[PDB]
Design a protein around this ligand. Structure first.
Ligand SMILES: CNc1ccccc1C(=O)SCCNC(=O)CCNC(=O)[C@H](O)C(C)(C)COP(=O)(O)OP(=O)(O)OC[C@H]1O[C@@H](n2cnc3c(N)ncnc32)[C@H](O)[C@@H]1OP(=O)(O)O
Ligand SMILES: CNc1ccccc1C(=O)SCCNC(=O)CCNC(=O)[C@H](O)C(C)(C)COP(=O)(O)OP(=O)(O)OC[C@H]1O[C@@H](n2cnc3c(N)ncnc32)[C@H](O)[C@@H]1OP(=O)(O)O
Lengths: 376, 376
């Protein structure tokens, strides 16, 4: 009996942010409307982001109160920490509440808790904050995944698979919770790649229950975590870097990070699926972290995916933005849900085998082979 | 076949710091020698710390260059980050190098890597830095445990047990690496409990190889990780807290944290050892995080331990200080080693069953049941 995903649920801050209105509002509130060339640069980024809206607990009101989070390098870590460390477990609890409610079991049957965030660290961490908030057993075995960035959505299923398979009867609550409080800053023309960050990053929390050997009479499998791998890309050092600094979380990118992922992604597909005997990347279903459209576009190209292998992935991208570790989890709610409503054979867009990708610092590719479960 | 510890090794910065000379040097270099009452307070703390020496990569030379790390709340996170993020994986590599060398297998047989530190976070983290430094397979499955404080020495064996038992043929490199770069500050009489921090915290790196089903002909078991539990202490909220701030890692303690651990520790001993049928806490061997002497003293009292159940633990305490997640690991090297040299029946001070405790924020108690292996 494999680690089986029994329930999923998501939560986002109330404040919707329309990407069409963002380049004006951003350069208004960062008092930069005279970098007209940079403003148009950022307008192009936002239009090609393929993100309709984003959710952000960070509002205009909070930003007016903290001017230094509106500068590019404003001394602002404390102010961000003060917001973010409350907001991370809070918005994680909203999602967790609903995921338990869907799972249909008392919270005292949750033996393990995996919490994951890059929006700020603390001692004790958001694992403790969330355990106190939900009222879980004081004996829950917790794993606190801090600052692992955008591949960490698959990390948390790679973690949970081992936790749950080596501990008969166990049930893991996973909570990913992410926000832009530590990364929001004003623009700088010595630092264009931070504009890339400002066009993509959103807030979002996702929660799962994972357990092996599900009880057929009281819980409903959605996916089976078959395998999970992790690899570093050759010659990719420095491509993504993020430092926690007196100015918050500074994020420094390279232009050809979309090229590193596309070039190398088949290596991971071959490593994972060839021993299974699967070689046609269109014959599987697809979850891929929408880090940027350029990542997903180029993997679609290099591999020859039909125009809609990545529908669910790009859909969550446009409706929510880059919510770091949560995206891959949101995408599985969308596709699990949408299949049922459109009545496809399996939660895997009718297909049997699936792949789930996380991309982030290293550069790192997390490769999770899934199995769908039938519908109706 | 249980998760078996195959090899251990330790490393420390060159700069030895004699606790007898520390209260003068500390108040000299923090330019505070006129808080004569506070200086004597700190002199009492240091004398009762039962710490002979500590190792610190942070030297007088580095401290003279960074005056703001000598103030109590000096804006200093960047300067500390700049030191610490190099030093963490570096000193972890020294230890890891030797642990592989003792294990007697090529580094390409290391399938997993668990890295653990509270001395500073980064993106990518010290898992990546250390993987690049040692030259491990790019496919090593990494778990990056950030900012889990002083119980994290047992966290990393609780993690490794599941990793290695659910992945036939696997071999886990654990590296804990800790230092006082982010926590060193000058004294403050509104903040006495930070003086407690200054009397105890040391630098130290520890590395292990953990694997289930060892090959009898080429690796030598030292311990078996039987079980691992984690619990929060009732009414203990706020007792230990640490925030990563513009001034570095601020650490705020409560006076009765030694009382929380002693009062509750038997709960965990009963939970772990009663199903095994073991009820005499003197009949087992003992590793306990020497967070402060008051912790170990009071657990010795509340439970009735003979005067030398805690010898190895207090020994590493006096010779090295509070090195956070590493201490519990150093203690297992000491006791494993010393038994052999004094020729006792088993690596467990001649005993069969053992306990290993981690203590830190939450408040959190990590309880790991070990098994010794025979000697000669
Ligand atoms: C630490 N991380 C995190 C932490 C927490 C949460 C999340 C994360 C992360 O998210 S992890 C990060 C993973 N995602 C990515 O790295 C994004 C990959 N890129 C794309 O997805 C698309 O490319 C865009 C950006 C939508 C542009 O759209 P598009 O127009 O199609 O691209 P173009 O190259 O044609 O031109 C676009 C114009 O912007 C310029 N420029 C674009 N890129 C970069 C870049 N790197 N560095 C420096 N400059 C750049 C470029 O020079 C050009 O100006 P010009 O020089 O041309 O004037
Ligand atoms: C985030 N964490 C980390 C992160 C990275 C790495 C490591 C960590 C950690 O390490 S996690 C932390 C786990 N360890 C502990 O919490 C230590 C437990 N305590 C002891 O081990 C012993 O007690 C001492 C301290 C040696 C004193 O020795 P001792 O003399 O025997 O104790 P006393 O109470 O008799 O008097 C001692 C004099 O200092 C005063 N005072 C002592 N304590 C405290 C305290 N809390 N808070 C406020 N004031 C205190 C006290 O009022 C008295 O002054 P007076 O008021 O009397 O003048």
């Amino acid at each position: 009996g494999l680690a089986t995903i029994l329930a999923i649920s998501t939560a986002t801050p109330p404040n919707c942010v329309i990407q069409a209105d963002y380049p004006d509002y951003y350069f208004k509130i960062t008092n930069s409307e005279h970098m007209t060339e940079l403003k148009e640069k950022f307008r192009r980024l936002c239009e090609k982001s393929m993100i309709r809206k984003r959710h952000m607990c960070l509002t205009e009101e909070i930003l007016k109160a903290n001017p230094n989070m509106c500068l590019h390098m404003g001394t602002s870590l404390n102010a961000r920490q003060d917001i973010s460390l409350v907001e991370v477990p809070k918005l994680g609890k909203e999602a967790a509440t609903k995921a338990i409610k869907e799972w249909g079991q008392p919270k005292s049957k949750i033996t393990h808790l995996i919490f994951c965030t890059s929006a700020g660290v603390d001692m004790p961490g958001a694992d403790y904050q969330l355990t106190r908030l939900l009222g879980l057993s004081p004996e829950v075995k917790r794993m606190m995944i801090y600052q692992q960035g955008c591949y960490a959505g698959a990390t948390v299923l790679r973690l949970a698979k081992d936790l749950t398979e080596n501990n008969k009867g166990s049930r893991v609550l996973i909570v990913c919770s992410e926000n832009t409080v530590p990364t929001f800053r004003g623009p700088s023309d010595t630092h264009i790649d931070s504009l890339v960050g400002q066009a993509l990053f959103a807030d979002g929390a996702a929660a799962l229950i994972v357990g092996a050997d599900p009880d057929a009479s009281i819980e409903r499998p959605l996916y089976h975590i078959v395998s999970a791998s992790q690899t570093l890309l050759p010659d990719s050092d420095g491509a993504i870097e993020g430092h926690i600094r007196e100015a918050g979380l500074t994020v420094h990118l390279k232009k050809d990070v979309p090229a590193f992922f596309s070039a190398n992604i088949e290596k991971s597909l071959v490593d994972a699926f060839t021993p299974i005997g699967i070689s046609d990347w269109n014959s599987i279903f697809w979850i891929a972290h929408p880090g940027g459209p350029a990542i997903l576009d180029q993997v679609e190209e290099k591999l020859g995916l039909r125009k809609d292998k990545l529908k669910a992935s790009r859909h969550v991208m446009s409706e929510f933005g880059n919510m770091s570790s949560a995206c891959v989890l949101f995408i599985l709610d969308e596709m699990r849900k949408t299949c049922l409503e459109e009545g496809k054979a399996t939660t895997g867009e009718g297909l049997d085998w699936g792949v789930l990708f996380g991309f982030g610092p290293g550069l790192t590719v997390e490769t999770v082979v899934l199995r769908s479960v039938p519908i109706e």
